[PDB]
Design an enzyme around this catalytic site. Structure first.
Site, PDB file in Angstrom:
ATOM      1  N   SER A   1     -13.318  32.809  27.085  1.00 59.97           N
ATOM      2  CA  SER A   1     -12.032  33.451  27.284  1.00 59.97           C
ATOM      3  C   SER A   1     -11.142  32.952  28.387  1.00 59.97           C
ATOM      4  O   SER A   1      -9.969  33.320  28.417  1.00 59.97           O
ATOM      5  CB  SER A   1     -12.214  34.956  27.396  1.00 59.97           C
ATOM      6  OG  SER A   1     -12.849  35.437  26.221  1.00 59.97           O
TER       7      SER A   1
ATOM      8  N   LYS B   1      -7.907  31.333  27.681  1.00 53.84           N
ATOM      9  CA  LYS B   1      -6.679  32.123  27.593  1.00 53.84           C
ATOM     10  C   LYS B   1      -5.678  31.866  28.729  1.00 53.84           C
ATOM     11  O   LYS B   1      -4.473  32.158  28.592  1.00 53.84           O
ATOM     12  CB  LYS B   1      -7.050  33.596  27.517  1.00 53.84           C
ATOM     13  CG  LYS B   1      -7.759  33.984  26.258  1.00 53.84           C
ATOM     14  CD  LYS B   1      -7.959  35.467  26.341  1.00 53.84           C
ATOM     15  CE  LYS B   1      -8.502  36.089  25.070  1.00 53.84           C
ATOM     16  NZ  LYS B   1      -9.884  35.764  24.716  1.00 53.84           N
TER      17      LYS B   1
ATOM     18  N   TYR C   1      -7.680  44.400  24.856  1.00 51.89           N
ATOM     19  CA  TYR C   1      -8.066  42.990  24.972  1.00 51.89           C
ATOM     20  C   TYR C   1      -8.470  42.433  23.597  1.00 51.89           C
ATOM     21  O   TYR C   1      -9.367  42.959  22.929  1.00 51.89           O
ATOM     22  CB  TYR C   1      -9.227  42.832  25.943  1.00 51.89           C
ATOM     23  CG  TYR C   1      -9.573  41.388  26.250  1.00 51.89           C
ATOM     24  CD1 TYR C   1      -8.845  40.673  27.214  1.00 51.89           C
ATOM     25  CD2 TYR C   1     -10.619  40.726  25.573  1.00 51.89           C
ATOM     26  CE1 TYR C   1      -9.140  39.339  27.502  1.00 51.89           C
ATOM     27  CE2 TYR C   1     -10.931  39.376  25.860  1.00 51.89           C
ATOM     28  CZ  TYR C   1     -10.178  38.694  26.823  1.00 51.89           C
ATOM     29  OH  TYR C   1     -10.411  37.373  27.112  1.00 51.89           O
TER      30      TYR C   1
ATOM     31  N   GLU D   1      -5.166  37.714  34.924  1.00 53.51           N
ATOM     32  CA  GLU D   1      -5.133  39.106  35.334  1.00 53.51           C
ATOM     33  C   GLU D   1      -5.160  39.054  36.856  1.00 53.51           C
ATOM     34  O   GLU D   1      -5.769  38.163  37.485  1.00 53.51           O
ATOM     35  CB  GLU D   1      -6.303  39.893  34.754  1.00 53.51           C
ATOM     36  CG  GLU D   1      -6.263  39.876  33.247  1.00 53.51           C
ATOM     37  CD  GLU D   1      -7.496  40.483  32.591  1.00 53.51           C
ATOM     38  OE1 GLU D   1      -8.194  41.294  33.222  1.00 53.51           O
ATOM     39  OE2 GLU D   1      -7.764  40.163  31.413  1.00 53.51           O
TER      40      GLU D   1
ATOM     41  N   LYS E   1     -10.188  35.655  35.840  1.00 49.17           N
ATOM     42  CA  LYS E   1     -10.442  35.657  34.403  1.00 49.17           C
ATOM     43  C   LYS E   1     -11.914  35.379  34.162  1.00 49.17           C
ATOM     44  O   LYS E   1     -12.477  34.425  34.707  1.00 49.17           O
ATOM     45  CB  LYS E   1      -9.603  34.599  33.659  1.00 49.17           C
ATOM     46  CG  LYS E   1      -9.583  34.777  32.120  1.00 49.17           C
ATOM     47  CD  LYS E   1      -9.008  36.144  31.756  1.00 49.17           C
ATOM     48  CE  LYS E   1      -8.989  36.407  30.278  1.00 49.17           C
ATOM     49  NZ  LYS E   1     -10.271  37.118  29.988  1.00 49.17           N
TER      50      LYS E   1
ATOM     51  N   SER F   1     -16.403  34.355  28.147  1.00 44.98           N
ATOM     52  CA  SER F   1     -17.703  34.241  27.500  1.00 44.98           C
ATOM     53  C   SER F   1     -17.646  33.637  26.064  1.00 44.98           C
ATOM     54  O   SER F   1     -16.603  33.659  25.380  1.00 44.98           O
ATOM     55  CB  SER F   1     -18.350  35.634  27.360  1.00 44.98           C
ATOM     56  OG  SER F   1     -18.242  36.426  28.530  1.00 44.98           O
TER      57      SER F   1
END
Length: 359
Positions: A63, A66, A149, A271, A314, A317
């Site tokens: 992830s 992202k 999410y 984030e 962030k 996985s």
């Protein structure tokens, strides 16, 4: 810990007990202290062959990919190619279902469309079945109100963001983000010629790599080593070290604040939480019970620009990998922890916090 040996102790004293408690075979770690990378490597990349993890070892970001998607979407916005304000429908005209409007590129980029699922179903193997999937999805909340999410939300943002460039997603990310930043060992598909550096992930004591999937590159498909990952962090920590181009603006957009959810702010991929931050707030917020749950989201009018006093992070996985990134631009302090075993997210955040609060 001014000294590199003091730094190495701060990392090891946390990482070693972590690998043993979580049965993690290998981990590559990068600490950016005063803006400079330092690497610490532990255990094995390949348990059967007994290969050690070194800084050349490629890990699956999951992830964390992202954050690349976010910055690529930010670079297309600075280019005038796409705007977050736009209806998704201007990038996918075949998406004619009525649930779809009011849903903006922003809602896709930030998981705020109304309940797109965590994962694209594995039944979905091409463009047609993916179209049918979004046409038949039923929102549980109104658009722009609830954060859930989702790979299915930002994965679609990524695939749509790149259509105005005329480039495939792999080509866009490679040309507009990886190459300009000299991340030459960062890929969507690892070359056969470089396979030897690719760690195996471990799921139930089994060596596995991520399986092909629709919107994988966009949502969880980047592979790199700790060297490129450290460069990615240092560049996001200090964008002004760049050339006032589209990419610089892109990095600024990805760390802008678009929503406030609890104690966090949602950027594009990234984030953030205000720094200093309570360890309890950040570790507990990363638990599946909270991080994978639907949460009300307050939209920031004129997205707030980046605040340097942030904990920017962030977790990423795949079935066989568990990686984490956190940085504080204010203190120019950062950490990258790439591991070939997907262990609980709270333990990643806890470990990084412990290392960073000691520096």
């Amino acid at each position: 810990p001014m000294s590199e040996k003091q730094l190495a102790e701060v990392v090891e004293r946390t990482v070693t007990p972590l690998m043993k408690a979580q049965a993690i075979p290998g981990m590559a770690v990068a600490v950016i202290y005063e803006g400079q990378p330092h690497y610490f490597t532990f255990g094995k990349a390949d348990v059967a062959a007994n290969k050690p993890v070194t800084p050349q070892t490629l890990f699956e970001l999951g992830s964390i990919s992202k954050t690349f998607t976010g910055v690529l979407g930010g670079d297309a916005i600075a280019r005038g190619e796409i705007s977050l304000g736009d209806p998704v429908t201007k990038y996918w005209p075949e998406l004619t279902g009525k649930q779809w409007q009011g849903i903006r590129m922003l809602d896709l980029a930030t998981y705020t469309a109304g309940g797109l699922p965590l994962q694209v179903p594995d039944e979905v193997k091409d463009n047609a079945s993916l179209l049918r999937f979004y046409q038949n999805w039923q929102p549980q909340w109104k658009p722009g109100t609830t954060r859930l999410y989702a790979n299915a939300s930002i994965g679609l943002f990524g695939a749509l963001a790149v259509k105005p460039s005329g480039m495939s997603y792999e080509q866009a990310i490679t040309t507009r983000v990886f190459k300009p930043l000299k991340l030459d060992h960062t890929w969507i598909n690892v070359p056969k010629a470089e396979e030897a550096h690719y760690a195996w992930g471990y799921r139930d004591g089994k060596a596995v790599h991520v399986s092909p999937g629709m919107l994988d590159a966009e949502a969880y498909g980047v592979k790199t080593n700790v060297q490129d990952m450290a460069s990615w962090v240092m560049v996001n920590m200090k964008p002004d070290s760049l050339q006032d181009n589209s990419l610089r603006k892109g990095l600024t957009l990805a760390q802008s604040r678009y929503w406030r959810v609890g104690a966090m702010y949602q950027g594009l991929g990234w984030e953030m939480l205000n720094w200093p931050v309570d360890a309890k707030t950040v570790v507990e917020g990363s638990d599946n019970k909270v991080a994978l749950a639907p949460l009300p989201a307050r939209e920031v009018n004129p997205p707030a620009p980046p605040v340097n006093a942030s904990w920017v992070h962030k977790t990423g996985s795949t079935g066989g990998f568990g990686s984490y990134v956190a940085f504080i631009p204010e203190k120019q302090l950062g950490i990258v922890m790439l591991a070939n075993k997907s262990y609980p997210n709270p333990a990643r955040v806890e470990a990084a916090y412990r290392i960073l609060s000691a520096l």
